[PDB]
Symmetry: C4
Subunit: 387 residues, 4 copies
């Protein structure tokens, strides 16, 4: 076993639907399907895995409080990308109401944040063993990405932040080898005031990048750019007139560098670098509601160009309720790039609480200048009354 | 591990029943037995496995629609040849309403077709990772074999087809190494007009063959013959007076080359080459209803000779409801041939929806000019009211 | 991995209770505990395992017919020696209403007999793959040991029989390497007329032996003695005045060689050779009812001496319902002998059918001239009303 | 694999909560959560594992008697540190109403005591096979630690004791290589009269120590000190004014060497050596009721100095009901010390019987003169009525 190196993502032809997690089907069926939020997909030591926080409950008679963000019962669990949480493939990982995880080629690296709001704590596990920690520095909900960390020759990196969820939230970048924090970088830059829930992908041998959430009125996502060799990072707002966050106003042309938006709030969304020159991102179809999930791409520098990001397609039924989304990269055994998949959360709720389905698209086929998407249908009308 | 090489099947003495999948027993017991259709057996990396599509539901209170063929909830799953779908051995593979799978000696190759009818997509996974795709070319239900692909020195081949399920459905052959499509052959030949649900088996070091379904009035099965070295294929109709499809008229002598039949429809059926000079196949005992499954064999060229195939025996209670059937081959360390087993589907239905049991016969023992069959009994009278 | 060699069993000090399978507890609890008969323990590739035929049903609402011996739904399953059938550790093996199994050091060897009474068939699996078969020669319920086969340097051996269960039942011995029957021995000798359900243990580098059931009026168990080098076997009645079968009359002194007994019927019981000079056996405490299970030993030749076998102790509560019993041998990594354990079946029945618990004693501690037993208490009075 | 060598624990910065076992959550959810008592954590071959005795039952309808200590249905089981007993991770080990376990770097050693009160037996398993026994010597509930044994170069040691739970209970130390008892030491010393439920940890390359329970009025804990090379042990009472047992009177200065206490009873408690010169221990916050669990540390000889131990923090909500506590050590590839975690039991009861949750803290981060503790909250108000 060798450490995976950072490498570009594979370009391709079409985003196909590798699998979906139909949690809601098993909730309505009546099995012990667990309440999960916010699911995504991460490539781990066992292969591709669905990963999510959970609540140490399950249907058909779940306990109260499944809509809560943080609690003593919150959980980090993984299961098969075509399974459901609570089935045979389910693995419990750690205590957590915020998490990250990734696989460096030898072992799984895991961040588990829990504890009280005024002094929460990141516990780092490597190989199933607790190996290190990180302490709250703003004393106001230390928290992390809710998606994959990123790795290269034994160094994995992971964003954390801490601070008022309306005011400033000065983020930090951790660099971790065999579960030990070797370096902590404070992220400065014109898009650093409030950065959270970064979705990070390796872009090339020496660089990775993230698209984050700004929970302030700003609708332009902060972008974190990091370099492996120097272990350094910086943040800038996206300049493309295509606003990626939710809620947001209409797309419009504004001078680069500054924040833009009138609607407080935010949503975690995927960063999908394609090859060394292309940038894609997911955004909701609805400007205010978390409905739909469309893929937008440009070949230009989205930090420097107000040029709009073209729509490649609808990952999901555009009126279906969605939620978070993030990508992960999976090795391709016979060429120098990683397959990239994006997982979008499909939130639902009812008499059995808040919960989420998952859908996983992957970019496959020979490289194309402009790709297309297979739309995943989300239609619960034949069983929603049992949810 | 070495790549498995194509080799003839082992002759034997008797078809014995290796195991039952008694899905109906567990449905009536009350456990979370999943609704499955076309189930069959395939030799995978874990060993012999029962393989089927499912609906992301289970008893005792299944969701509506288990009878449907293609929905967004359809998935591909595998379990123990002697277990039941949903039990501890169950593994969820991918999103699929049509599938193929096989094991090349190093990894499982898996083909998962889903998406809309007018533009479905085959996603190809190898060793658990999505590696490639193939797009719809007739824009009318791209689909595939619902049984094993075949392999040799890292190359595995799989039939796909596309087009109206009554009109022309010109099929194609994929040749795949490590999950990457290396060659696509349009299959031509006098029996190639409408070809689907091919059941394929390695015949010899350089040959493999398939017996397919023609869904028109024609009751002679299309037979696909392929050569590994040239990666080349051809389709011809069977000629023997023993008509293999269901529905069919009486057996009768007719000139070779042309289709023949009076009732539209079809049924996936097993091709069972036995050694180098012997051909067997399965067919329903009933000419019109999917009831019973008898085994017919000949030592002649079924594509060139009208001779009746000799009924070897009844795999199953001949008035029992059956369904699809197909074979798979299992390595034998002792000699240079593979063991061959046939799986026959046993469809049932009731209060808990549409579903199926499975029975698995294997040819074992000293080679015999003519073999016998243990008839697996199918009698549900003691518990059918709970179905 | 090397093949295990035949070696003597380890002498010791006390029979301790390594574990029990409390099927009845989980039946009363209300989980999906499976109806099993007749359980025993066998050392397999995964370690010590509880092994039994089952019925493809489970509580809390089992289907009818769990008291049947042979049926299409009968099953061979294994699970953890301290588990229960149907729990997480359960493995389904094959179709079977009669079975054997053992582990040769590289792979598991398994015999699965099923099919109709007038022509049943043994299917042999090696390593999870069907490898060979054996055919009914008396056309009257081919059947086998229901306990471990025995192995040595790749040859495992297993008793089978066939014939009227009241009249003659001329048994045969199979010798099997990598799943292939290499030799079949017809067992002659003055105790061969009716031999079934042999319980076989390796005794020394070149010899194994079995204590069998004679279902005729005879209460003296047939003993099969076999030699590895010549692959040969012979049968003689036990001569000890201590009658080991059930039902049986009082112990009494009679001339060696002949049958003795007045009560038709029989029961499978354990053969426990201790070292190279000692012979133990289990028998019911009650002479007619299958209640209790006591261990009897002698250092003399039980085929040649009417000397009584001394009672070492009560494996189980002497008034508790028991059933079958048989031993299995487990390697001891640091000396030339195998630990021996005896598993006794504890049958129970009720509103949820016929079923069985299991208890496993093993002989541990430094060698003693006369050993002792820890009595396993069997008392269901706090939950039996839920059975 | 190499045998693990005895080595000091790692100092750190903060006790963080690695995971909850929320058995109560799953009992109230309605799944088959098993009733467990004294649960703790132990590093085994699989990794960190939650370990406990159980009753061969589970919710939602458990069988009577879950409150009992020693019955024929008691068994030893292990599961995920973040799962629940009975879930997918559950493993059944042996029959036991008292136990120990550890992993020597190659295999799990496991000690299982069961049998009648006046003659119980310790069965010793190594790597899954029964290897040895130890017999009752006081004929009054032979019993053991209910926590990890300790290992070094293939030798693992375990405390056992025997005798009235109020009168003298002279303990013994077993030294075991590959499951065979190599040495038994009668532990003498001024604190050796009544010694039970010792919680033992490797202290340095040649030393390990235990903090035990004295079930008389005495509230100073017996401390066992053992040397690996001589395989030699001794028992002395703790002297610090900080009384560790429960029930206890107020802390007060008293002369070293003698017992001291006013209330009969006792409670298993954790010994937590930290590096070479530091000692911590757990005790209830409440002096009489098993409520809360605070961590106390000193850098002095607790056996020779009256100095109070400094309260480091509350592991748990201090009015929450707790129970047993004990530590385990986890290898660290990065340096020459082991990580140390403490598991505190959280007993609950109700309609579904007696049961327990588990919380697991681990010392992580840069070494600190004095460490802090994340307080794991225990609040069941939202679901307790279902317990
Ligand atoms: C990091 C974003 C912010 C932290 C307070 O709120 C998030 C928004 C969420 C949301 O908008 O849906 C759900 C997240 N579970 C929550 N994170 C935490 C740690 O509570
Ligand atoms: C749509 C054509 C197709 C033949 C390949 O019909 C099949 C017939 C079936 C049948 O005759 O029972 C059931 C199959 N699930 C179905 N396959 C798909 C993909 O829907
Ligand atoms: C080999 C013994 C004889 C065979 C007819 O009866 C056995 C007696 C049994 C018994 O006495 O309890 C149960 C066994 N399941 C049965 N075996 C078969 C194959 O049916
Ligand atoms: C019988 C003495 C013994 C102390 C080692 O009492 C323990 C006290 C217990 C307790 O105080 O809660 C519960 C333990 N399960 C019990 N152990 C056994 C073996 O019964
Ligand atoms: Ca915003
Ligand atoms: Ca047809
Ligand atoms: Ca008899
Ligand atoms: Ca005390």
């Amino acid at each position: 076993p060798k450490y995976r190196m950072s490498r570009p993502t594979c370009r391709g032809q079409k985003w196909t639907v590798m699998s979906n997690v139909w949690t809601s089907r098993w909730v309505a069926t009546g099995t012990n399907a667990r309440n999960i939020r916010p699911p995504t997909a991460i490539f781990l030591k066992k292969g591709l895995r669905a990963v999510s926080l959970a609540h140490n409950t399950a249907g058909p008679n779940p306990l109260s409080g499944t809509g809560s963000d943080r609690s003593e019962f919150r959980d980090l669990i993984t299961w098969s990308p075509s399974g459901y949480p609570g089935d045979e493939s389910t693995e419990t990982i750690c205590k957590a109401w915020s998490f990250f995880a990734c696989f460096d080629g030898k072992e799984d690296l895991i961040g588990c944040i829990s504890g009280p709001d005024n002094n929460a704590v990141l516990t780092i596990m490597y190989g199933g063993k607790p190996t290190d920690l990180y302490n709250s520095y703003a004393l106001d909900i230390l928290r992390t990405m809710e998606s994959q960390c990123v790795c290269n020759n034994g160094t994995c990196s992971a964003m954390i932040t801490d601070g008022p969820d309306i005011g400033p939230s000065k983020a930090r970048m951790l660099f971790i080898k065999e579960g030990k924090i070797e370096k902590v970088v404070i992220v400065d830059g014109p898009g650093s005031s409030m950065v959270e829930e970064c979705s990070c992908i390796n872009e090339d041998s020496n660089e990775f990048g993230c698209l984050c959430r700004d929970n302030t009125a700003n609708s332009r996502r902060p972008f974190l750019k990091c370099f492996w060799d120097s272990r350094t990072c910086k943040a800038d707002y996206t300049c493309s007139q295509t606003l990626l966050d939710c809620p947001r106003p209409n797309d419009s042309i504004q001078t680069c560098g500054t924040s833009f938006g009138s609607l407080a709030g935010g949503l975690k969304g995927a960063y999908i670098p394609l090859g060394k020159g292309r940038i894609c991102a997911t955004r909701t179809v609805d400007k205010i509601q978390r409905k739909g999930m469309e893929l937008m791409c440009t070949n230009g520098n989205i930090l420097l160009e107000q040029d709009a990001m073209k729509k490649i397609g609808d990952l999901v039924t555009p009126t279906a309720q969605t939620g978070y989304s993030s990508a992960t990269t999976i090795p391709r055994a016979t060429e120098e790039c990683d397959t990239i998949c994006v997982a979008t959360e499909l939130v639902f709720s009812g008499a059995k609480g808040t919960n989420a389905d998952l859908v996983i698209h992957c970019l496959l086929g020979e490289a194309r200048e402009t790709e297309s998407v297979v739309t995943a249908v989300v239609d619960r009308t034949t069983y929603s009354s049992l949810l």
